[PDB]
Ligand binder design. Structure first.
Ligand code: ADP
Ligand code: ADP
Ligand code: MG
Ligand code: MG
Length: 552
């Protein structure tokens, strides 16, 4: 490949969760160990099962792998670090401060932002270490800090004083400032770091990774690489129309890549049929009738309990918008009123159908404009009082995903209120962290009361998830966060199930088996009511074809 040539000491990875960062990291580590240089693979997901593939148990203590000479493994548990932060920042105040303060501290130091800050703290601890970076020539991490975290950490300003901002986790950063300054300088220096982007060959994932690359370039990183992982071999589509459609879409995505990413060196990794579970599988990486309930049952249930909101939620690039459009169109077909408030300005799903259908309506909310408006509105509140440094720190904080989600939710609140006895399908619900924080802080923009959302009879938060390991685990994490917030997701929607589709080729068959395992797990111990949506061969961008989703 083009990204394993005379590589520097450190080597990070980053991309959408579940695109194969761990597999590529392990393969690169194995190859470098075979070359002759000592490496130190550092996994990040606690449930990665990295130790399983290598054949040895891996923990917080560095442990050599006997199978591969000159290979050392290590693990960082961001959840453990976050729990430690909460315990050592809350215990001293517990039992002496009012319950409201304790609740606020607990909420602020919890959620995705806290885990990201803890992960960067552990990364900095590994970097600029006494002998960790002096004994092992190469270190190959498995997930890199987001641009927001890097921007926050290098910014100066007192951190010993942590309304919806996410500057709480920075208060738990015990180490000296010079430590993180040196860590960030080492990370940004092209001589030491070679950040690698891994992104599936799809439009949404490519645009997301392009945005992350733009952020990282803004930070200061100069040289990067791209590794498009997930290309389906052309010959695999010899006699399967679904395989032909998949290959056509993948090739179209490759042909039209975002302009910003064109200059970067690019690589391709074929989807090897052999399942990546053993050492042999990772060595060569770089070189059925499913009968499960469809969306008909979900639509019937919603139809039975009408005058309710159907607010999807899930990590980006899992087809939330298309599913919301399909549900809204199906409900409109029955004659019941719907208000499909999608938030995808890039493409139109229900265009030209508003006038054709008597009762259907739409409201296109642009997340970028809403985020910018919220940022501007909050800059002049709590900005004048703060000194220049404080204002800069707050402005940097307000670029987090939490701010964008809060802005989107606030923009959606007015749509909710203007709709009474009428269905309202959403596009992107706020996570549990945002709901809890906005409810605790609040006790022109106005947000819907948490009372309505928590009510089982007026808020059916469906959770859309792709059918793979990591997407399922992160969706389960989101469900746990929502349950902490007090709202119970009503059902689950597994999307893009090749097994549900007609697959008659080797690679598609293996993927279908894996997704069947995931669906079984989801039905067993994640959701009491789940629906599987197949991978439609034709892209669902029309109005009459959307019914294909609801009536496979
Ligand atoms: N090039 C590839 N060929 C075949 N399978 C792959 C490839 N890349 C990733 N996978 C599959 O993806 C699954 C999960 O990938 P993972 O390493 O967890 O990505 P991430 O670390 O981003 O979640 C693995 O079980 C593996 O089989
Ligand atoms: N059930 C499905 N079958 C096939 N493709 C799908 C399905 N759902 C979504 N997609 C594809 O996924 C792409 C991106 O999904 P999108 O809905 O934009 O994600 P988000 O909800 O984060 O906006 C779309 O271009 C769409 O064609
Ligand atoms: Mg992973
Ligand atoms: Mg969307």
């Amino acid at each position: 490949m083009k990204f394993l040539q005379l590589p520097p000491r450190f080597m990070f990875f980053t991309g959408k969760g579940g695109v194969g960062k761990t597999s590529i990291a392990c393969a690169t580590s194995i190859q470098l160990a075979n070359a002759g240089k000592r490496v130190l693979l550092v996994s990040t997901d606690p449930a990665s099962n990295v130790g399983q593939v290598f054949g040895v148990d891996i923990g917080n203590r560095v442990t050599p792998i006997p199978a591969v000479p000159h290979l050392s493994a290590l693990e960082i548990d961001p959840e453990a670090a976050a729990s430690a932060y909460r315990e050592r920042l809350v215990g001293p105040v517990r039992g002496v401060l009012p319950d409201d303060v304790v609740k606020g501290i607990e909420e602020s130091l919890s959620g995705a932002c806290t885990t990201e800050i803890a992960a960067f703290d552990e990364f900095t601890a590994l970097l600029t270490n006494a002998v960790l970076t002096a004994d092992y020539q190469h270190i190959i991490f498995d997930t890199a800090p987001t641009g927001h975290t890097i921007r926050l950490l290098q910014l100066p300003g007192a951190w010993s004083g942590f309304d919806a901002s996410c500057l709480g986790p920075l208060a738990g950063l015990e180490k000296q400032r010079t430590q993180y300054k040196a860590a960030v300088e080492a990370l940004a220096d092209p001589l030491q770091t070679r950040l690698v982007l891994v992104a599936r060959a799809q439009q949404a994932t490519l645009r997301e990774v392009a945005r992350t690359h733009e952020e990282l370039a803004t930070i200061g990183i100069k040289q990067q690489h791209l590794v498009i992982n997930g290309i389906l071999p052309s010959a695999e589509a010899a006699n399967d129309p679904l395989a032909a459609a998949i290959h056509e879409r993948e090739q179209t995505a490759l042909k039209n890549i975002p302009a910003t990413l064109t200059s970067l060196p690019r690589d391709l990794v074929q989807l090897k049929p052999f399942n990546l579970v053993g050492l042999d599988a990772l060595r060569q990486l770089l070189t059925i009738e499913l009968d499960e309930p469809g969306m008909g049952d979900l639509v019937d249930g919603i139809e039975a309990d009408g005058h309710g909101l159907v607010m999807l939620m899930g990590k980006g690039g899992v087809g939330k918008t298309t599913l919301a459009a399909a549900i809204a169109v199906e409900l409109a077909h029955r004659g019941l009123p719907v208000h499909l408030t999608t938030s995808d300005p890039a493409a139109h799903l229900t265009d030209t159908l508003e006038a054709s259908l008597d009762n259907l309506t739409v409201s296109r909310i642009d997340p970028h404009a809403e985020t910018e408006r919220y940022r501007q509105h909050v800059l002049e509140t709590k900005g004048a009082q703060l000194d220049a440094e404080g204002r800069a720190l707050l402005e940097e904080d307000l670029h987090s995903p939490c701010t964008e989600e809060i802005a989107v939710f606030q923009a959606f609140s007015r749509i909710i209120r203007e709709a009474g006895k009428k269905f309202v399908v959403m596009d992107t619900a706020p996570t549990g962290h945002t709901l809890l924080l906005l409810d605790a802080t609040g006790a022109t923009h106005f947000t819907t009361p948490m009372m309505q959302l928590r009510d089982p009879n007026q808020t059916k938060v469906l959770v859309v998830t792709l059918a793979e390991t990591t997407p399922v685990l992160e969706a389960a994490k989101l469900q746990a966060d929502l349950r902490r917030a007090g709202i119970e997701p009503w059902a689950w929607i597994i999307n893009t199930s090749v097994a549900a589709a007609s697959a008659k080729s080797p690679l598609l068959r293996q993927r279908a088996a894996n997704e069947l395992r995931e669906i079984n797990a989801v039905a067993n111990h994640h959701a009491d009511r789940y629906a599987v949506v197949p991978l439609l061969k034709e892209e669902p961008i029309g109005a009459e074809r959307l019914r294909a989703l609801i009536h496979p």
